[PDB]
Write a protein that binds this ligand. Structure first.
Ligand SMILES: C[C@H](CCC(=O)NCC(=O)O)[C@H]1CC[C@H]2[C@@H]3[C@H](O)C[C@@H]4C[C@H](O)CC[C@]4(C)[C@H]3CC[C@]12C
Ligand SMILES: C[C@H](CCC(=O)NCC(=O)O)[C@H]1CC[C@H]2[C@@H]3[C@H](O)C[C@@H]4C[C@H](O)CC[C@]4(C)[C@H]3CC[C@]12C
Length: 127
């Protein structure tokens, strides 16, 4: 049940993650505790990851499972990566960064490991 809109519900190791990745304070407090909306559309194996920022810049990155996708972050990073699925879980491969998206009881939880820190973000499914 990836298709749908997701809104910030909970998170774990936020500060730890940002402190490790070396995220600037200006962006950290800017992108924290904010209602990020992730709109997902089911297109075969191509899942659209749309990140909406309240009163700020938006980011939209679509990816096809087992296909290289063009991605961009909110910090202004242009890059590409390959995304695959492991048992209904969307996993992306990155250098010292591991992102996995899955559904836990009707909730979307993205796990991002970086430099040892495991960042989790639970988003509820709404329409
Ligand atoms: C919200 C800010 C961008 C704020 C912004 O640019 N506002 C308008 C402006 O000042 O131009 C973005 C930039 C870096 C983004 C973070 C980085 O991408 C790291 C990490 C990425 C995860 O997908 C979401 C959480 C997390 C931690 C992001 C939260 C949102 C951040 C902090
Ligand atoms: C790993 C980067 C964040 C790297 C970082 O440190 N950013 C800080 C900054 O914004 O400067 C995040 C931001 C965009 C995220 C990708 C986009 O959300 C698109 C896609 C979403 C899927 O749920 C997971 C794979 C995939 C491809 C995500 C993997 C993790 C990415 C690529």
């Amino acid at each position: 049940a990836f298709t749908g809109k997701y809104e910030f519900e909970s998170d774990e190791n936020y500060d730890d993650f940002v402190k490790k990745i070396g995220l600037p304070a200006d962006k950290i407090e800017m992108g924290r505790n904010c209602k990020i909306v992730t709109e997902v559309v089911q297109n075969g194996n191509d899942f659209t990851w749309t990140q909406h920022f309240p009163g700020g810049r938006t980011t939209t990155n679509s990816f096809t499972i087992d296909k290289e996708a063009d991605m961009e972050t909110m910090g202004g990073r242009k890059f590409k990566a390959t995304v695959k699925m492991e048992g209904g879980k969307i996993v992306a491969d990155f250098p010292n960064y591991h992102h996995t998206a899955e559904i836990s009881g009707g909730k979307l939880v993205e796990i991002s490991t970086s430099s040892g820190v495991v960042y989790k973000r639970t988003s509820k499914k709404i329409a």
